[PDB]
Amino acid sequence: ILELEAERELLNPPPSPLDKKFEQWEEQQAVEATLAAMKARRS
Amino acid sequence: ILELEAERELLNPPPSPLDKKFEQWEEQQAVEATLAAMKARRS
Amino acid sequence: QEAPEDLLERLLGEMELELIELRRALAQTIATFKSTERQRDAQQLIAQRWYEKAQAALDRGNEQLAREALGQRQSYQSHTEALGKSLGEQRALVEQVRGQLQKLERKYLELKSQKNLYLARLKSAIAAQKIEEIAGNLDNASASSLFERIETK
Amino acid sequence: ERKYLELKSQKNLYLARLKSAIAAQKIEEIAGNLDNASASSLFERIETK
Amino acid sequence: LLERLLGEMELELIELRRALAQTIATFKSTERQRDAQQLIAQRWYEKAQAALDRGNEQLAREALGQRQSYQSHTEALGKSLGEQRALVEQVRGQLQKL
Protein backbone atom coordinates (compact mmCIF):
# COMPACT_ATOMS: atom_id res chain seq x y z
CA ILE A 1 0.00 0.00 0.00
CA LEU A 2 2.68 2.50 1.01
CA GLU A 3 4.82 2.30 -2.12
CA LEU A 4 1.97 3.31 -4.43
CA GLU A 5 1.10 6.35 -2.32
CA ALA A 6 4.74 7.41 -2.58
CA GLU A 7 4.57 6.84 -6.33
CA ARG A 8 1.61 9.22 -6.44
CA GLU A 9 3.43 11.88 -4.43
CA LEU A 10 6.54 11.27 -6.53
CA LEU A 11 4.53 12.03 -9.67
CA ASN A 12 2.96 14.87 -7.66
CA PRO A 13 4.54 18.03 -6.39
CA PRO A 14 3.98 17.39 -2.69
CA PRO A 15 2.80 20.77 -1.41
CA SER A 16 5.96 22.27 0.02
CA PRO A 17 5.96 24.13 3.35
CA LEU A 18 6.25 27.28 1.23
CA ASP A 19 3.07 26.67 -0.75
CA LYS A 20 1.50 25.37 2.45
CA LYS A 21 2.63 28.66 3.98
CA PHE A 22 1.55 30.64 0.92
CA GLU A 23 -1.76 28.80 0.57
CA GLN A 24 -2.33 29.10 4.32
CA TRP A 25 -1.10 32.69 4.32
CA GLU A 26 -3.12 33.69 1.26
CA GLU A 27 -6.02 31.86 2.88
CA GLN A 28 -5.11 33.77 6.03
CA GLN A 29 -5.04 36.83 3.78
CA ALA A 30 -8.15 35.64 1.92
CA VAL A 31 -10.12 35.11 5.12
CA GLU A 32 -8.74 38.39 6.47
CA ALA A 33 -9.23 40.20 3.15
CA THR A 34 -12.75 38.80 2.83
CA LEU A 35 -13.19 39.68 6.50
CA ALA A 36 -11.65 43.11 5.94
CA ALA A 37 -14.30 44.05 3.38
CA MET A 38 -17.05 42.94 5.76
CA LYS A 39 -15.60 44.63 8.84
CA ALA A 40 -15.41 47.89 6.88
CA ARG A 41 -18.78 47.59 5.14
CA ARG A 42 -20.72 47.17 8.40
CA SER A 43 -19.67 50.72 9.38
CA ILE B 1 -2.71 17.80 -35.37
CA LEU B 2 0.04 20.38 -35.85
CA GLU B 3 1.91 18.65 -38.67
CA LEU B 4 -1.12 18.59 -40.96
CA GLU B 5 -1.81 22.29 -40.47
CA ALA B 6 1.79 22.97 -41.46
CA GLU B 7 1.31 20.73 -44.48
CA ARG B 8 -1.65 22.89 -45.47
CA GLU B 9 0.33 26.11 -45.08
CA LEU B 10 3.25 24.47 -46.88
CA LEU B 11 0.98 23.76 -49.84
CA ASN B 12 -0.42 27.27 -49.28
CA PRO B 13 1.25 30.60 -49.76
CA PRO B 14 1.01 31.77 -46.16
CA PRO B 15 -0.06 35.40 -46.53
CA SER B 16 3.20 37.27 -46.20
CA PRO B 17 3.48 40.47 -44.14
CA LEU B 18 3.59 42.26 -47.49
CA ASP B 19 0.25 40.91 -48.71
CA LYS B 20 -1.04 41.32 -45.17
CA LYS B 21 0.20 44.90 -45.45
CA PHE B 22 -1.13 45.26 -48.99
CA GLU B 23 -4.45 43.60 -48.19
CA GLN B 24 -4.71 45.62 -44.98
CA TRP B 25 -3.48 48.75 -46.75
CA GLU B 26 -5.75 48.29 -49.76
CA GLU B 27 -8.51 47.54 -47.26
CA GLN B 28 -7.34 50.66 -45.44
CA GLN B 29 -7.46 52.31 -48.86
CA ALA B 30 -10.71 50.51 -49.71
CA VAL B 31 -12.42 51.61 -46.50
CA GLU B 32 -10.93 55.08 -46.95
CA ALA B 33 -11.70 55.16 -50.67
CA THR B 34 -15.23 53.91 -50.04
CA LEU B 35 -15.36 56.41 -47.18
CA ALA B 36 -13.87 59.12 -49.40
CA ALA B 37 -16.73 58.86 -51.90
CA MET B 38 -19.27 59.09 -49.08
CA LYS B 39 -17.57 61.96 -47.26
CA ALA B 40 -17.55 63.93 -50.53
CA ARG B 41 -21.06 62.98 -51.67
CA ARG B 42 -22.71 64.20 -48.45
CA SER B 43 -21.59 67.75 -49.32
CA GLN C 1 -5.60 2.23 -64.59
CA GLU C 2 -9.10 3.52 -63.89
CA ALA C 3 -10.34 6.71 -65.50
CA PRO C 4 -9.45 9.23 -62.75
CA GLU C 5 -12.27 11.52 -63.90
CA ASP C 6 -15.01 9.19 -62.61
CA LEU C 7 -13.48 9.20 -59.13
CA LEU C 8 -13.99 12.97 -58.92
CA GLU C 9 -17.74 12.55 -58.42
CA ARG C 10 -17.26 9.75 -55.90
CA LEU C 11 -14.70 11.79 -53.98
CA LEU C 12 -17.06 14.73 -53.47
CA GLY C 13 -19.91 12.31 -52.81
CA GLU C 14 -18.00 11.02 -49.81
CA MET C 15 -16.69 14.54 -49.14
CA GLU C 16 -20.02 15.84 -47.85
CA LEU C 17 -20.08 13.00 -45.32
CA GLU C 18 -17.00 14.46 -43.63
CA LEU C 19 -18.23 18.05 -43.78
CA ILE C 20 -21.59 17.20 -42.21
CA GLU C 21 -19.79 15.04 -39.65
CA LEU C 22 -17.60 18.07 -38.97
CA ARG C 23 -20.66 20.28 -38.50
CA ARG C 24 -21.95 17.86 -35.86
CA ALA C 25 -18.63 17.80 -34.03
CA LEU C 26 -18.22 21.55 -33.58
CA ALA C 27 -21.53 21.87 -31.74
CA GLN C 28 -20.51 19.33 -29.11
CA THR C 29 -17.47 21.53 -28.50
CA ILE C 30 -19.46 24.64 -27.63
CA ALA C 31 -21.94 22.44 -25.77
CA THR C 32 -19.35 21.74 -23.08
CA PHE C 33 -17.53 25.07 -23.42
CA LYS C 34 -20.69 26.89 -22.39
CA SER C 35 -21.67 24.07 -20.03
CA THR C 36 -18.74 24.85 -17.74
CA GLU C 37 -19.85 28.49 -17.69
CA ARG C 38 -23.19 27.45 -16.22
CA GLN C 39 -21.39 25.06 -13.90
CA ARG C 40 -19.08 27.91 -12.92
CA ASP C 41 -22.13 30.11 -12.44
CA ALA C 42 -23.66 27.56 -10.07
CA GLN C 43 -20.39 27.22 -8.15
CA GLN C 44 -19.94 30.97 -7.71
CA LEU C 45 -23.64 31.20 -6.88
CA ILE C 46 -23.05 28.63 -4.15
CA ALA C 47 -20.10 30.72 -3.03
CA GLN C 48 -22.45 33.70 -3.07
CA ARG C 49 -24.81 31.69 -0.88
CA TRP C 50 -21.89 30.84 1.39
CA TYR C 51 -20.81 34.47 1.10
CA GLU C 52 -24.38 35.51 1.90
CA LYS C 53 -24.53 33.12 4.85
CA ALA C 54 -21.28 34.65 6.06
CA GLN C 55 -23.03 38.02 5.81
CA ALA C 56 -25.83 36.55 7.91
CA ALA C 57 -23.21 34.99 10.19
CA LEU C 58 -21.62 38.40 10.71
CA ASP C 59 -25.02 39.80 11.67
CA ARG C 60 -25.85 39.51 15.38
CA GLY C 61 -22.15 39.14 16.20
CA ASN C 62 -21.75 35.49 15.15
CA GLU C 63 -18.56 36.16 13.23
CA GLN C 64 -17.35 32.65 14.08
CA LEU C 65 -19.55 31.04 11.43
CA ALA C 66 -18.63 33.71 8.88
CA ARG C 67 -15.02 32.58 9.19
CA GLU C 68 -16.12 29.04 8.37
CA ALA C 69 -18.56 30.30 5.74
CA LEU C 70 -15.97 32.61 4.20
CA GLY C 71 -13.31 29.96 4.78
CA GLN C 72 -15.65 27.46 3.15
CA ARG C 73 -16.12 29.86 0.22
CA GLN C 74 -12.35 29.92 -0.32
CA SER C 75 -12.56 26.33 -1.54
CA TYR C 76 -15.04 27.36 -4.22
CA GLN C 77 -13.21 30.64 -4.81
CA SER C 78 -10.14 28.70 -5.90
CA HIS C 79 -12.39 26.33 -7.84
CA THR C 80 -14.17 29.36 -9.28
CA GLU C 81 -10.90 31.11 -10.10
CA ALA C 82 -9.57 27.91 -11.68
CA LEU C 83 -12.60 27.39 -13.93
CA GLY C 84 -13.04 31.06 -14.80
CA LYS C 85 -9.59 31.22 -16.37
CA SER C 86 -10.20 27.93 -18.19
CA LEU C 87 -13.35 29.43 -19.71
CA GLY C 88 -11.46 32.55 -20.78
CA GLU C 89 -8.72 30.63 -22.57
CA GLN C 90 -11.15 28.14 -24.11
CA ARG C 91 -12.71 31.13 -25.89
CA ALA C 92 -9.75 31.29 -28.26
CA LEU C 93 -9.95 27.50 -28.58
CA VAL C 94 -13.38 27.83 -30.19
CA GLU C 95 -12.31 30.94 -32.13
CA GLN C 96 -9.65 29.18 -34.20
CA VAL C 97 -11.93 26.28 -35.14
CA ARG C 98 -14.57 28.84 -36.07
CA GLY C 99 -11.87 30.57 -38.10
CA GLN C 100 -10.89 27.13 -39.37
CA LEU C 101 -14.39 26.24 -40.55
CA GLN C 102 -15.51 29.60 -41.95
CA LYS C 103 -12.85 29.49 -44.66
CA LEU C 104 -13.72 25.83 -45.20
CA GLU C 105 -17.11 26.20 -46.89
CA ARG C 106 -16.20 29.07 -49.21
CA LYS C 107 -13.58 26.89 -50.88
CA TYR C 108 -15.70 23.77 -51.42
CA LEU C 109 -18.53 25.63 -53.15
CA GLU C 110 -16.10 27.20 -55.61
CA LEU C 111 -14.23 23.90 -55.89
CA LYS C 112 -17.52 22.20 -56.73
CA SER C 113 -18.39 25.19 -58.93
CA GLN C 114 -15.59 24.63 -61.45
CA LYS C 115 -15.96 20.85 -61.25
CA ASN C 116 -18.75 20.79 -63.80
CA LEU C 117 -17.27 23.32 -66.22
CA TYR C 118 -14.32 21.16 -67.24
CA LEU C 119 -16.36 17.96 -67.34
CA ALA C 120 -18.22 19.57 -70.22
CA ARG C 121 -14.93 20.52 -71.87
CA LEU C 122 -13.78 16.91 -71.59
CA LYS C 123 -17.10 15.60 -72.85
CA SER C 124 -16.85 18.22 -75.58
CA ALA C 125 -13.58 16.69 -76.77
CA ILE C 126 -14.63 13.03 -76.57
CA ALA C 127 -17.19 13.96 -79.21
CA ALA C 128 -14.66 15.85 -81.33
CA GLN C 129 -12.31 12.87 -81.45
CA LYS C 130 -15.10 10.42 -82.25
CA ILE C 131 -16.70 12.50 -85.01
CA GLU C 132 -13.23 12.97 -86.47
CA GLU C 133 -12.37 9.33 -85.77
CA ILE C 134 -15.48 8.22 -87.63
CA ALA C 135 -14.74 10.94 -90.18
CA GLY C 136 -11.54 8.98 -90.73
CA ASN C 137 -13.68 6.17 -92.10
CA LEU C 138 -15.55 8.79 -94.16
CA ASP C 139 -12.44 10.57 -95.44
CA ASN C 140 -11.31 12.44 -98.55
CA ALA C 141 -9.60 9.28 -99.94
CA SER C 142 -6.32 10.07 -98.15
CA ALA C 143 -6.57 6.73 -96.32
CA SER C 144 -9.27 5.02 -98.43
CA SER C 145 -10.26 3.09 -95.31
CA LEU C 146 -13.94 2.43 -96.05
CA PHE C 147 -15.49 4.27 -99.00
CA GLU C 148 -12.69 4.10 -101.57
CA ARG C 149 -12.18 0.37 -100.98
CA ILE C 150 -15.79 0.04 -102.12
CA GLU C 151 -15.03 2.14 -105.20
CA THR C 152 -12.40 -0.47 -106.06
CA LYS C 153 -15.00 -3.25 -106.14
CA GLU D 1 -13.81 12.83 -7.44
CA ARG D 2 -12.84 16.45 -8.07
CA LYS D 3 -10.02 15.30 -10.34
CA TYR D 4 -11.97 12.80 -12.45
CA LEU D 5 -14.73 15.25 -13.34
CA GLU D 6 -12.19 17.79 -14.58
CA LEU D 7 -10.19 14.99 -16.20
CA LYS D 8 -13.33 13.89 -18.01
CA SER D 9 -14.15 17.56 -18.62
CA GLN D 10 -11.15 18.24 -20.87
CA LYS D 11 -11.39 14.80 -22.49
CA ASN D 12 -13.98 15.94 -25.00
CA LEU D 13 -12.42 19.31 -25.83
CA TYR D 14 -9.32 17.88 -27.49
CA LEU D 15 -11.22 15.09 -29.24
CA ALA D 16 -12.92 17.87 -31.18
CA ARG D 17 -9.56 19.47 -31.91
CA LEU D 18 -8.30 16.14 -33.25
CA LYS D 19 -11.46 15.58 -35.25
CA SER D 20 -11.10 19.17 -36.41
CA ALA D 21 -7.70 18.37 -37.90
CA ILE D 22 -8.63 15.05 -39.51
CA ALA D 23 -11.01 17.10 -41.62
CA ALA D 24 -8.40 19.76 -42.40
CA GLN D 25 -5.94 17.17 -43.70
CA LYS D 26 -8.57 15.39 -45.78
CA ILE D 27 -10.03 18.51 -47.37
CA GLU D 28 -6.49 19.61 -48.15
CA GLU D 29 -5.54 16.06 -49.16
CA ILE D 30 -8.46 15.95 -51.57
CA ALA D 31 -7.63 19.55 -52.49
CA GLY D 32 -4.33 18.07 -53.62
CA ASN D 33 -6.26 16.23 -56.32
CA LEU D 34 -8.06 19.51 -57.07
CA ASP D 35 -4.94 21.67 -57.11
CA ASN D 36 -3.64 24.78 -58.88
CA ALA D 37 -1.72 22.63 -61.43
CA SER D 38 1.38 22.49 -59.21
CA ALA D 39 1.12 18.69 -59.18
CA SER D 40 -1.34 18.16 -62.06
CA SER D 41 -2.49 14.99 -60.29
CA LEU D 42 -6.08 14.77 -61.56
CA PHE D 43 -7.47 17.78 -63.43
CA GLU D 44 -4.49 18.81 -65.54
CA ARG D 45 -3.88 15.24 -66.71
CA ILE D 46 -7.38 15.49 -68.17
CA GLU D 47 -6.47 18.78 -69.85
CA THR D 48 -3.69 16.87 -71.59
CA LYS D 49 -6.17 14.46 -73.18
CA LEU E 1 14.23 3.11 -66.30
CA LEU E 2 13.73 6.88 -66.53
CA GLU E 3 9.99 6.55 -65.91
CA ARG E 4 10.52 4.06 -63.08
CA LEU E 5 13.13 6.31 -61.48
CA LEU E 6 10.79 9.30 -61.27
CA GLY E 7 7.94 6.99 -60.28
CA GLU E 8 9.91 6.06 -57.18
CA MET E 9 11.25 9.63 -56.96
CA GLU E 10 7.95 11.09 -55.77
CA LEU E 11 7.93 8.58 -52.92
CA GLU E 12 11.05 10.21 -51.48
CA LEU E 13 9.83 13.77 -52.03
CA ILE E 14 6.50 13.14 -50.31
CA GLU E 15 8.34 11.29 -47.54
CA LEU E 16 10.56 14.36 -47.27
CA ARG E 17 7.52 16.63 -47.01
CA ARG E 18 6.27 14.56 -44.08
CA ALA E 19 9.63 14.70 -42.32
CA LEU E 20 10.06 18.47 -42.33
CA ALA E 21 6.79 19.03 -40.48
CA GLN E 22 7.86 16.82 -37.58
CA THR E 23 10.92 19.05 -37.30
CA ILE E 24 8.96 22.26 -36.77
CA ALA E 25 6.51 20.32 -34.61
CA THR E 26 9.15 19.93 -31.91
CA PHE E 27 10.98 23.18 -32.68
CA LYS E 28 7.84 25.13 -31.82
CA SER E 29 6.90 22.62 -29.12
CA THR E 30 9.88 23.65 -27.00
CA GLU E 31 8.79 27.27 -27.37
CA ARG E 32 5.47 26.44 -25.72
CA GLN E 33 7.31 24.34 -23.15
CA ARG E 34 9.65 27.27 -22.58
CA ASP E 35 6.62 29.53 -22.30
CA ALA E 36 5.13 27.30 -19.61
CA GLN E 37 8.44 27.17 -17.73
CA GLN E 38 8.91 30.94 -17.75
CA LEU E 39 5.23 31.29 -16.88
CA ILE E 40 5.87 29.06 -13.88
CA ALA E 41 8.85 31.26 -13.07
CA GLN E 42 6.51 34.22 -13.43
CA ARG E 43 4.19 32.51 -10.96
CA TRP E 44 7.15 31.92 -8.67
CA TYR E 45 8.23 35.48 -9.41
CA GLU E 46 4.69 36.63 -8.67
CA LYS E 47 4.59 34.61 -5.46
CA ALA E 48 7.87 36.26 -4.50
CA GLN E 49 6.12 39.58 -5.12
CA ALA E 50 3.36 38.39 -2.80
CA ALA E 51 6.03 37.10 -0.40
CA LEU E 52 7.64 40.55 -0.33
CA ASP E 53 4.27 42.07 0.52
CA ARG E 54 3.51 42.23 4.26
CA GLY E 55 7.23 41.94 5.04
CA ASN E 56 7.60 38.19 4.43
CA GLU E 57 10.75 38.61 2.38
CA GLN E 58 11.95 35.22 3.62
CA LEU E 59 9.70 33.31 1.22
CA ALA E 60 10.57 35.65 -1.65
CA ARG E 61 14.19 34.54 -1.27
CA GLU E 62 13.06 30.93 -1.64
CA ALA E 63 10.57 31.88 -4.35
CA LEU E 64 13.13 33.97 -6.21
CA GLY E 65 15.79 31.40 -5.37
CA GLN E 66 13.41 28.74 -6.64
CA ARG E 67 12.89 30.76 -9.82
CA GLN E 68 16.65 30.74 -10.45
CA SER E 69 16.40 27.03 -11.22
CA TYR E 70 13.87 27.75 -13.95
CA GLN E 71 15.70 30.93 -14.97
CA SER E 72 18.74 28.84 -15.88
CA HIS E 73 16.44 26.27 -17.47
CA THR E 74 14.64 29.12 -19.23
CA GLU E 75 17.90 30.74 -20.33
CA ALA E 76 19.18 27.36 -21.54
CA LEU E 77 16.11 26.60 -23.64
CA GLY E 78 15.66 30.14 -24.94
CA LYS E 79 19.08 30.09 -26.59
CA SER E 80 18.42 26.61 -27.98
CA LEU E 81 15.25 27.93 -29.61
CA GLY E 82 17.12 30.89 -31.09
CA GLU E 83 19.82 28.75 -32.69
CA GLN E 84 17.35 26.11 -33.86
CA ARG E 85 15.76 28.87 -35.96
CA ALA E 86 18.68 28.73 -38.39
CA LEU E 87 18.45 24.93 -38.25
CA VAL E 88 14.99 25.08 -39.82
CA GLU E 89 16.03 27.93 -42.14
CA GLN E 90 18.64 25.92 -44.04
CA VAL E 91 16.34 22.94 -44.57
CA ARG E 92 13.69 25.38 -45.75
CA GLY E 93 16.34 26.84 -48.03
CA GLN E 94 17.29 23.27 -48.90
CA LEU E 95 13.76 22.26 -49.89
CA GLN E 96 12.62 25.44 -51.66
CA LYS E 97 15.23 24.99 -54.39
CA LEU E 98 14.33 21.29 -54.47
Numbering used by the authors:
A (entry chain 3), B (entry chain 2): 175 to 217
C (entry chain 0): 22 to 174
D (entry chain 1): 126 to 174
E (entry chain k): 28 to 125
Source paper text:
The bacterial member PspA is part of the phage shock protein (psp) response that maintains structural integrity of membranes under stress conditions such as temperature and infection. Interestingly, PspA is related to eukaryotic and archaeal endosomal sorting complexes required for transport (ESCRT)-III proteins and has a similar structure. Here, we show that rods of bacterial ESCRT-III protein PspA internalize and thin membrane tubules by overcoming the required bending energy through progressive membrane binding of the N-terminal helix in the PspA assembly.
In the presence of EPL membranes, the rods had a wider diameter and a broader diameter distribution (200 to 345 Å) in comparison with the diameter values and distribution of the previously analyzed apo protein (180 to 290 Å). By segmenting the rods of the EPL-PspA sample and sorting the segments according to diameter through classification, we determined a total of 10 cryo-EM structures with resolutions ranging from 4.7 to 6.5 Å. While the imposed helical symmetry parameters suggested no architectural relationship between the PspA rods, helical lattice plots revealed that the left-handed helical rung corresponding to layer line ~110 Å in the power spectrum increased in Bessel order from n = 10, 11, 12…18 with increasing diameters of 200, 215, 235…345 Å, respectively. Upon insertion of an additional subunit into the helical rung, the assembly widens in discrete steps of around 20 Å up to a diameter of 345 Å. As indicated in the simulations, the energy required for membrane bending likely is too high for thinner rods to bend and internalize membrane tubules.
